[PDB]
Paper text:
Here, we presented structural and phylogenetic analyses of two meropenem-sensitive Mtb penicillin-binding proteins, [name] and Rv3330. A search of the Mtb genome for Peptidase_S11 Pfam family proteins (PF00768) yielded two hits: [name] and Rv3330. The structures showed similar overall folds containing two subdomains.
Because the wild-type [name] was poorly soluble and failed to crystallize, we undertook extensive construct optimization using the GFP folding reporter method. Several rounds of directed evolution to improve solubility yielded an optimized gene sequence carrying six point mutations. Rv2911opt was bound to a molecule of the nonspecific inhibitor, PMSF, carried over from the purification. In both structures, the inhibitors were covalently linked to the serine of the first motif (STIK in [name], SVIK in Rv3330). In the Rv2911opt-PMSF structure the conformation of the inhibitor was not unique, and the electron density for the phenyl group of the ligand suggested at least two alternate conformations. Neither conformation appeared stabilized by additional enzyme-inhibitor interactions. Cys100 of Rv2911opt was found in a disulfide with Cys102 from a symmetry-related molecule. In the Rv3330 crystals, Cys77 residues from adjacent molecules formed a disulfide across a two-fold axis. Of the four mutations in Rv2911opt, two, A113V and T197I, were buried, while the other two, N208D and G289D, were exposed and participated in a crystal contacts.
Author numbering: 29 to 291
């Protein structure tokens, strides 16, 4: 659970969580880090990994009508318009665009083959408790899907190893093509502004998943990665931003030579 002799970790709304070293892969602490829950939009990180593995950032696609129809939220993809893989990754990661997700899946061969590719990729990473049902993290034909706090940081750790991902996820904003003729899209990960040394994160929410989060931070040459699942913020209670900051602060204060397990 945590190293013998370390100080208490303050509780927060997230029901499962884990704190790991992003570079060493060592686990510092966890609560039910292997219990499965729906991932919501944290799974968009797994989608981004498949896109980065298979698609050139300069490659383009002309969106279909089906690409542009999706449940909240959307970046604003429009039918008949052209988009680069980089632009779709911006929409996917900065504002959690489900149309961007749809459109990337189009490029990877459709919804079904994209989900299959995502599940194959998770297996190769050792994320063996993860089952995506949609590219977006929305509910789909197979239901809400599944992952675990452990599997989420494994997936995020692999994404952070790609410097393209590390850059996009930490981007404050980007310019996205619109029908007049560019719109500023702003990174929704508030940890970037709330917690110094934060280097990126992905939030998620559905009714089935409740709130989810996976992200990383750096302090003095040390880098940590955390994931948090299945939480609801109560009025006057700690937020996901509070708990993320507390987990990072606990982890950086921990003896740098201490760990409880390996990813």
């Amino acid at each position: 659970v945590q190293p013998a002799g370390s100080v208490p970790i303050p509780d927060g709304p997230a029901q499962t969580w884990i704190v790991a070293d992003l570079d060493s892969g060592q686990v510092l602490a966890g609560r039910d880090q292997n219990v499965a829950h729906p991932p919501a939009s944290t799974i968009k990180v797994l989608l981004a990994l498949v896109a980065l593995d298979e698609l050139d950032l300069n490659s383009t696609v002309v969106a279909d009508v089906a690409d542009t129809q999706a449940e909240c939220n959307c970046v604003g993809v429009k039918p008949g318009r052209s988009y680069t893989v980089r632009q779709l990754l911006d929409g996917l990661l900065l504002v959690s665009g489900n149309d961007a997700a749809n459109t990337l899946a189009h490029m990877l061969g459709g919804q079904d083959v994209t989900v299959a590719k995502m599940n194959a990729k998770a297996a190769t990473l050792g994320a063996t408790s993860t089952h995506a049902t949609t590219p977006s993290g929305l509910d789909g034909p197979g239901g809400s899907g599944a992952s675990t706090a452990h599997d989420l940081v494994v997936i995020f750790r692999a994404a952070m190893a790609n410097p393209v991902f590390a850059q996009i996820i930490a981007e404050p904003s980007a310019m996205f093509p619109s029908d007049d003729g560019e719109q500023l899209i702003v990174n929704q990960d508030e940890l970037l502004q709330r917690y110094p040394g934060a280097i990126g994160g992905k939030t998620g929410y559905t009714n089935a998943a409740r709130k989810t989060f996976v992200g990383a931070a750096a302090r003095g040459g040390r880098r940590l990665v955390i994931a948090m699942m299945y939480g609801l913020v109560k009025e006057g209670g700690p937020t996901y931003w509070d708990q993320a900051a507390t987990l990072f602060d606990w982890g950086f204060a921990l003896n740098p030579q201490a760990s409880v397990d390996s990813l």
